[PDB]
Design a binder for this molecule. Structure first.
Ligand SMILES: *[C@@H]1O[C@H](CO)[C@@H](O)[C@H](O)[C@H]1NC(C)=O
Ligand SMILES: *[C@@H]1O[C@H](CO)[C@@H](O)[C@H](O)[C@H]1NC(C)=O
Ligand SMILES: *[C@@H]1O[C@H](CO)[C@@H](O)[C@H](O)[C@H]1NC(C)=O
Ligand SMILES: *[C@@H]1O[C@H](CO)[C@@H](O)[C@H](O)[C@H]1NC(C)=O
Ligand SMILES: *[C@@H]1O[C@H](CO)[C@@H](O)[C@H](O)[C@H]1NC(C)=O
Ligand SMILES: *[C@@H]1O[C@H](CO)[C@@H](O)[C@H](O)[C@H]1NC(C)=O
Ligand SMILES: *[C@@H]1O[C@H](CO)[C@@H](O)[C@H](O)[C@H]1NC(C)=O
Ligand SMILES: *[C@@H]1O[C@H](CO)[C@@H](O)[C@H](O)[C@H]1NC(C)=O
Ligand SMILES: *[C@@H]1O[C@H](CO)[C@@H](O)[C@H](O)[C@H]1NC(C)=O
Ligand SMILES: *[C@@H]1O[C@H](CO)[C@@H](O)[C@H](O)[C@H]1NC(C)=O
Ligand SMILES: *[C@@H]1O[C@H](CO)[C@@H](O)[C@H](O)[C@H]1NC(C)=O
Ligand SMILES: *[C@@H]1O[C@H](CO)[C@@H](O)[C@H](O)[C@H]1NC(C)=O
Ligand SMILES: *[C@@H]1O[C@H](CO)[C@@H](O)[C@H](O)[C@H]1NC(C)=O
Ligand SMILES: *[C@@H]1O[C@H](CO)[C@@H](O)[C@H](O)[C@H]1NC(C)=O
Lengths: 409, 119, 185, 49
C-alpha cells in the first residue's frame, strides 16, 4: 500500500481535420483547350463524381471540427480573480494580450507545426471555423471545467470552489477527501510543476506533434504528386496539350489527347480515392477525440488508460492546427510499503470484514486502511461488518475489535 | 524558365530578348448561396478565392476570406450558422433578402465562482 | 452507374448492338474494347465507393450495437454517450435502415447559491461530510447530497474525522449533533 | 494479383517476350503499353483493397 502519491500530467495528441481541398476536373485535364474539353465529355459524369466525392469530405471536415468542439451551449468566461486554491492555470487559460486570445501552450502547439502554390485547377477551401473561434470553444470548455466541474456538461453550470471540486475527483478514484485537504499545498505544487513541465516536453522531444505534422505532410504530398503527374506524358508524343494541338491535325491530335486524358483521369481518381480513405481515418480520430472531450473534459472517466496513465482526475483541452490536444491530469501512487494482511478478523466467535477498506498489520497491531493511500485507522464496528462465524473464512486471523460504545457508560 | 513542377512560367522575347513572366489568368470556383426555391428566388453568388476587384454590382458586395460575395448584405450582427460560407462567415435568408454575417458560437455566460459558494 | 452506360467512351456509339450490327469483326472489336474499358472502370469505381461507404456504415452499426448494449441493457456513466444529462435508461425503436434510441436522462434544474466549506471544526477535530456537501443558508449549516438539495442536520452519522483543524484551508466552527445524547438522557 | 499476369488485356499475348519476338518495335510498343495499363490496373486494385 502506497504512503505517498504523485500528480502528473500527460499530453495526448489527436488529429481532427484535413485540408479542405477541391478540384476543377476539367481544368486539371483540359485547361483552356476546347478540343480536349469536348473529348472529356465522352467519359460521362466522371467529372461530377469527383467533385461530389471531394465536396463530401470537404464538408465532413467541418463536421468533424464541430463534433470535437462546440460541446457547450454557452461560452463561459474565466473569473477576474483566479483563486483556485493554489492551482495555476495561466499556461492553459487564454492570454488577453495577444490578438489571437490563445493560451501560452496553444501558441507553442501552433508554432511547432509547419503548414509552390501553383493553381492548375487545384484549390483549397478555408475551414468554417476560424482559429480564433476554436480558441473560444476551447476557452469555454476550460473555464467551465475549472469553475463548474462536470455540471456544465449535464445541464446548467453550477459554481464550485476548485479545491472542493478536486475533493470530488479524488473521491471518484477511491481516495478519501482527507487526502486532498490535508495535502492541498503539495497537490497544487505538484500540479503547477507538472504543467510547467509541458513546456519543456513540447519545446524538446523534437517536433513532438508528429501526428498532426504527418496529416499535413500527407495532404501536401498528395497534392504535389497530383500536380507532377501532369508532366508524365502517358504514351502521348508530348506532355503539353498545347504542343500537341499546335503540331498535329485534328484527328491526329485527338488520338494523342485521349492518352493524356486517360492518364489524368486515373491520376484524379487515384487522388480522390486516397482522400476518401484518409478522410475515414481522420473521421475515426475525430470521433475518438470527440468521445474523449465528452468523457474526460466534461467528466472523469473510469476507463483505464483512456485518459492518461494512472487514476483519472480531470483533463484540459488545447487547440491545435488540425487537431486537439488533451492534457490529462492523473493520480499515480508512490512510496510503497509492505504490510501483512488478512481477509477477515476473528472476534467474539464472529467474522469481521472491513468496510470500504482493507485490514493490515503494523507487525504488532492491526488497522483498517483505504486503498491507494495508507492512512491507517483503528479497527472498530464503524469500519467493519459481521457475517457468520469464523470457521468458514480461509486465512482469517485473531484480533480485538474496539469500542463501539463501551467507553461511554 | 520553369516552376517547381512544370510550365515555363517565363519566356524570353525573340526580338527584344527581354524576360516576361507568365501568370495564368485569374480563376476560381463559383457557387450559389440559396434558400429553398419554395421560400425565395433570390440568391447570392460567391466567387471562390478571388479579389473584389475581379469578376467584371456595388452595395451588396462583400469581400471575405473565402472569396468575393455578391448579392448578400453584410451586417454587424451575429446568429447561429445557417448557410455556411467559410472563415467564420455564413449567410441566412430573412424577411426581404440574404444576409452575410459572422456566426455566433453561442450565448455568453459567467459562472459566479467564489472560494466559499456553491450552487 | 446506369447513366454511364449511355456514355460513348471514344467509340462510334454507346450502343453495343449498334456497333455489332453496323461493323464487322475487325472493326467492331475495337469499338467494343473501348466501351468495355470505360464501363469496367465505371463499375470498379462504383464498387470501390460502396466498400468505403460500407465501412462507414459498419462503424455506425458497431456504435449502435455498443450503445444498445451499454444504454439499453444497462445504465451508462459515460458522459454524453446517452444524450445530454445523467443517464437513467434508453428505449430503442426500429427504423428502415437503422435504429433510433430514445435516451432518458436526468437534468438538474432551479439551482440556488449556498455558502459552503470543505470541513467543520468541532472540539478541535476536522469533520468531513460523508457522501455529501456542507452548505449554509446564511444562519445555519446543513449537509446535503450533491445532485439535489436536501438540507439534513449535521450529525456524527453523516461525517467522519481525520485529524486537527490546523491543516484545513476553509474549515468553519460548528456543532456536530451526536445522536446518542438524547438516547443516553 | 499473380493470376492477373497470365492475361491478355486485349493483347496478343500475356508474355512480353512473345510480343517482342513476334512484332516489330512500333507494333510491340502498342501491345506492351496495353499490358502495362492492364497490369497497373491490377496493382491499383490490389493496393486499394
Ligand atoms: C511525498 O513526496 C514529496 C516529494 O515528492 C514530499 O515532499 C512529501 O513530503 C511526501 N509526503 C509524505 C507523506 O511523505
Ligand atoms: C502562475 O505562473 C506564472 C509563471 O510565469 C507566474 O508569473 C504567475 O504569477 C503564477 N500565478 C499564480 C497565481 O501563482
Ligand atoms: C517488499 O518486499 C520485497 C521482497 O522482495 C522487497 O523487494 C521490496 O523492496 C519490499 N518493499 C518495501 C517497501 O519494503
Ligand atoms: C507500529 O510498528 C512499530 C515498530 O515498527 C511499533 O513500535 C509500534 O508500536 C506499532 N504501532 C502501534 C500502535 O503499536
Ligand atoms: C501461506 O502459504 C504458506 C506456505 O508454507 C502456508 O504455510 C500458510 O499457512 C499460508 N497462509 C495462508 C493464509 O494461506
Ligand atoms: C483465536 O481466538 C480463539 C478463541 O476461542 C482461540 O481458540 C484461537 O486459538 C485463537 N487463534 C489464535 C491464532 O490464537
Ligand atoms: C530588331 O532590329 C532593329 C535593328 O534593325 C533593332 O533596333 C530592334 O531593337 C530589334 N528588335 C525589335 C523588337 O525591333
Ligand atoms: C412550400 O411551402 C408551403 C408553405 O405553406 C408548404 O405548405 C408546402 O408544402 C411547401 N412545398 C414543398 C415542396 O416544400
Ligand atoms: C485586391 O487588390 C488590391 C489592389 O490594391 C489589394 O490592395 C487588396 O489587398 C486585394 N484584396 C484581396 C482580397 O486580394
Ligand atoms: C456596421 O458595419 C459597417 C460596415 O462598413 C460599419 O461601417 C458600421 O460602422 C457598422 N455599424 C456599427 C454600429 O457597428
Ligand atoms: C446567485 O447567482 C446569481 C447568478 O449568478 C446571482 O445573480 C445572485 O446574486 C447569486 N446570489 C447569491 C446569494 O450569491
Ligand atoms: C434558513 O434561514 C433561516 C433564517 O433566515 C433559519 O431560521 C433557518 O433555520 C435556516 N434553515 C432552514 C432549513 O430553514
Ligand atoms: C476567500 O477569499 C477571501 C479573499 O477574497 C479570503 O480572505 C478568504 O480567507 C478566502 N476563504 C477561503 C475559505 O479560501
Ligand atoms: C473559530 O474559527 C477560527 C478560524 O480562524 C479559529 O481560529 C477559532 O479558534 C475558532 N473558535 C473556536 C472556539 O475554536
Amino acid at each position: 500500500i502506497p504512503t505517498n502519491f504523485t500528480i502528473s500530467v500527460t499530453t495526448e495528441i489527436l488529429p481532427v481535420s484535413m485540408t479542405k481541398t477541391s478540384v476543377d476536373c476539367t481544368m486539371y485535364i483540359c485547361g483552356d483547350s476546347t478540343e480536349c474539353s469536348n473529348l472529356l465529355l465522352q467519359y460521362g459524369s466522371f467529372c461530377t463524381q469527383l467533385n461530389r466525392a471531394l465536396t463530401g469530405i470537404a464538408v465532413e471536415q467541418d463536421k468533424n471540427t464541430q463534433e470535437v468542439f462546440a460541446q457547450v451551449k454557452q461560452i463561459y468566461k474565466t473569473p477576474p480573480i483566479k483563486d483556485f486554491g493554489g492551482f495555476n492555470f495561466s499556461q492553459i487559460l487564454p492570454d488577453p494580450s495577444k490578438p489571437s486570445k490563445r493560451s501560452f501552450i496553444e501558441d507553442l502547439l501552433f508554432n511547432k507545426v509547419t503548414l509552390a502554390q501553383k493553381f492548375n485547377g487545384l484549390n483549397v477551401l478555408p475551414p468554417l471555423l476560424t482559429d480564433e473561434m476554436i480558441a473560444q470553444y476551447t476557452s469555454a470548455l476550460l473555464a467551465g471545467t475549472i469553475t463548474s466541474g462536470w455540471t456544465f456538461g449535464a445541464g446548467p453550470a453550477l459554481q464550485i470552489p476548485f479545491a472542493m471540486q478536486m475533493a470530488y475527483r479524488f473521491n471518484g478514484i477511491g481516495v478519501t477527501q482527507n487526502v486532498l485537504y490535508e495535502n492541498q499545498k503539495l497537490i497544487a505544487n505538484q500540479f503547477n510543476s507538472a504543467i510547467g513541465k509541458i513546456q519543456d516536453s513540447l519545446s524538446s522531444t523534437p517536433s513532438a506533434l508528429g501526428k498532426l505534422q504527418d496529416v499535413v505532410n500527407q495532404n501536401a504530398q498528395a497534392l504535389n504528386t497530383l500536380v507532377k503527374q501532369l508532366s508524365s506524358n502517358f504514351g502521348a508524343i508530348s506532355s503539353v496539350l498545347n504542343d500537341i494541338l499546335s503540331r498535329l491535325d485534328k484527328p491526329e491530335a485527338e488520338v494523342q489527347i485521349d492518352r493524356l486524358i486517360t492518364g489524368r483521369l486515373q491520376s484524379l481518381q487515384t487522388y480522390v480515392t486516397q482522400q476518401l480513405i484518409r478522410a475515414a481515418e481522420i473521421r475515426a480520430s475525430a470521433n475518438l477525440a470527440a468521445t474523449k472531450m465528452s468523457e474526460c473534459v466534461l467528466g472523469q472517466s473510469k476507463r483505464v488508460d483512456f485518459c492518461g496513465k494512472g487514476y483519472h482526475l480531470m483533463s484540459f483541452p488545447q487547440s491545435a492546427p488540425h487537431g486537439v490536444v488533451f492534457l490529462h491530469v492523473t493520480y499515480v501512487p508512490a512510496q510503497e510499503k509492505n504490510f501483512t494482511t488478512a481477509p477477515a478478523i476473528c472476534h467474539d466467535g464472529k467474522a469481521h470484514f472491513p468496510r470500504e477498506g482493507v485490514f493490515v498489520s503494523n507487525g504488532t497491531h492491526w488497522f483498517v486502511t483505504q486503498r491507494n493511500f495508507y492512512e491507517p485507522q483503528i479497527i472498530t464496528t464503524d469500519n467493519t461488518f459481521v457475517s457468520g462465524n469464523c470457521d468458514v473464512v480461509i486465512g482469517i486471523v485473531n484480533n480485538t475489535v474496539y469500542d463501539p460504545l463501551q467507553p461511554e457508560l | 524558365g520553369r516552376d517547381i513542377a512544370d510550365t515555363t512560367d517565363a519566356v524570353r522575347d525573340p526580338q527584344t530578348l527581354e524576360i516576361l513572366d507568365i501568370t495564368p489568368c485569374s480563376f476560381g470556383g463559383v457557387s450559389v448561396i440559396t434558400p429553398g426555391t419554395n421560400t425565395s428566388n433570390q440568391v447570392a453568388v460567391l466567387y471562390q478565392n478571388v479579389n473584389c476587384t475581379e469578376v467584371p454590382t456595388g452595395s451588396n458586395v462583400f469581400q471575405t476570406r473565402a472569396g468575393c460575395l455578391i448579392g448578400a448584405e453584410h451586417v454587424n450582427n451575429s446568429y447561429e450558422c445557417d448557410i455556411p460560407i467559410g472563415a467564420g462567415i455564413c449567410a441566412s435568408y430573412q424577411t426581404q433578402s440574404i444576409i452575410a454575417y459572422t456566426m455566433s458560437l453561442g450565448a455568453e455566460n459567467s459562472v459566479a465562482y467564489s472560494n466559499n459558494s456553491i450552487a | 452507374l446506369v447513366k454511364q452506360l449511355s456514355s460513348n467512351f471514344g467509340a462510334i456509339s454507346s450502343v453495343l448492338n449498334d456497333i455489332l450490327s453496323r461493323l464487322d469483326k475487325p472493326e467492331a472489336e475495337v469499338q467494343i474494347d473501348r466501351l468495355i474499358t470505360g464501363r469496367l472502370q465505371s463499375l470498379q469505381t462504383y464498387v470501390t465507393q460502396q466498400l468505403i461507404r460500407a465501412a462507414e456504415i459498419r462503424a455506425s452499426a458497431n456504435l449502435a450495437a455498443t450503445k444498445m448494449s451499454e444504454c439499453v441493457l444497462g445504465q451508462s456513466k459515460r458522459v454524453d454517450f446517452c444524450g445530454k444529462g445523467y443517464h437513467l435508461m434508453s428505449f430503442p425503436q426500429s427504423a428502415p435502415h437503422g435504429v433510433v434510441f430514445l435516451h432518458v436522462t436526468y437534468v438538474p434544474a432551479q439551482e440556488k447559491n449556498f455558502t459552503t466549506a470543505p470541513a467543520i471544526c468541532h472540539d478541535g477535530k476536522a469533520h468531513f461530510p460523508r457522501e455529501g456537501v456542507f452548505v449554509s443558508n446564511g444562519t445555519h449549516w446543513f449537509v446535503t447530497q450533491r445532485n439535489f438539495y436536501e438540507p439534513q442536520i449535521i450529525t456524527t452519522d453523516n461525517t467522519f474525522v481525520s485529524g486537527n483543524c490546523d491543516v484545513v484551508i476553509g474549515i468553519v466552527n460548528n456543532t456536530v449533533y451526536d445522536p446518542l445524547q438524547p438516547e443516553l438522557d
